[PDB]
Amino acid sequence: APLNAARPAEERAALLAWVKERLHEEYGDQDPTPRRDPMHELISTILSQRTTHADEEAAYQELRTLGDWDAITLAPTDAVAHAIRRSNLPESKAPRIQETLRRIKAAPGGYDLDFLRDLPVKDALKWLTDLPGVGVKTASLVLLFNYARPVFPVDTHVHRVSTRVGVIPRMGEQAAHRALLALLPPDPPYLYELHINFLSHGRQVCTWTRPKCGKCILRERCDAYALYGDKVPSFSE
Ligand code: SF4
Ligand SMILES: [Mg+2]
Ligand SMILES: [Mg+2]
Numbered sequence: 001a002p003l004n005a006a007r008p009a010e011e012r013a014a015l016l017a018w019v020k021e022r023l024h025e026e027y028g029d030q031d032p033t034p035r036r037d038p039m040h041e042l043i044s045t046i047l048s049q050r051t052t053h054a055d056e057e058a059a060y061q062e063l064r065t066l067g068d069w070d071a072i073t074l075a076p077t078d079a080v081a082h083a084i085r086r087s088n089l090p091e092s093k094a095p096r097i098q099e100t101l102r103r104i105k106a107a108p109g110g111y112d113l114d115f116l117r118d119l120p121v122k123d124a125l126k127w128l129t130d131l132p133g134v135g136v137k138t139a140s141l142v143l144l145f146n147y148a149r150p151v152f153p154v155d156t157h158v159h160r161v162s163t164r165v166g167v168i169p170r171m172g173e174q175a176a177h178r179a180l181l182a183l184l185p186p187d188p189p190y191l192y193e194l195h196i197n198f199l200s201h202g203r204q205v206c207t208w209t210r211p212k213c214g215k216c217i218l219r220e221r222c223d224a225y226a227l228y229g230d231k232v233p234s235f236s237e
Pocket of ligand 2: 104105106107108109110111112
């Protein structure tokens, strides 16, 4: 009996579409994501590096008390750093934010990313990942959620469930963005449902430590259960 992770890409894509159908029945069109507007999502991410959810939201809203975006680009970095002080090491985050805002204003349009809509996917991605503090996961999130482009953001929840099941072998999170997208159709609503359903399943069942495999709708095709049964270890390295 071969593990899922060693199976051909075509077999692993059939597996992932089965996974998506099962998660759709457990969770439907349920959405545990922030669903923010583009500028909010981008800046939030920068503030949300080595930082809890409650502290990032607090850091974002106090940031926005400095003024609108144009005011934050011009506010002295001392003021920006003190406002976001409840996030991860505000000294480093404050310049990345200012520079990101600066580079967005210079783009065609106001503090808005209307051009990412009708741009080649690879090019839209590369433009966001060139912004300081923005990685492929945040760029994929903004492109999928706000502009309905066919990209698939892979957060820790998505990465953990998909790896444990064996839809992909173990690899870095950035490499997993290309690997899973390669198994998926260019169908933005499909990708967004798949994403939010992974978040629900990772938060509720396939948890970082002690997953609840006995309540898991995927257990019968899960590599991790096949290997460890009731003793699936914490998602490591
Ligand atoms: S069987 Fe366990 S490890 Fe596998 S997907 Fe379900 S909860 Fe995660
Ligand atoms: Mg602009
Ligand atoms: Mg970057």
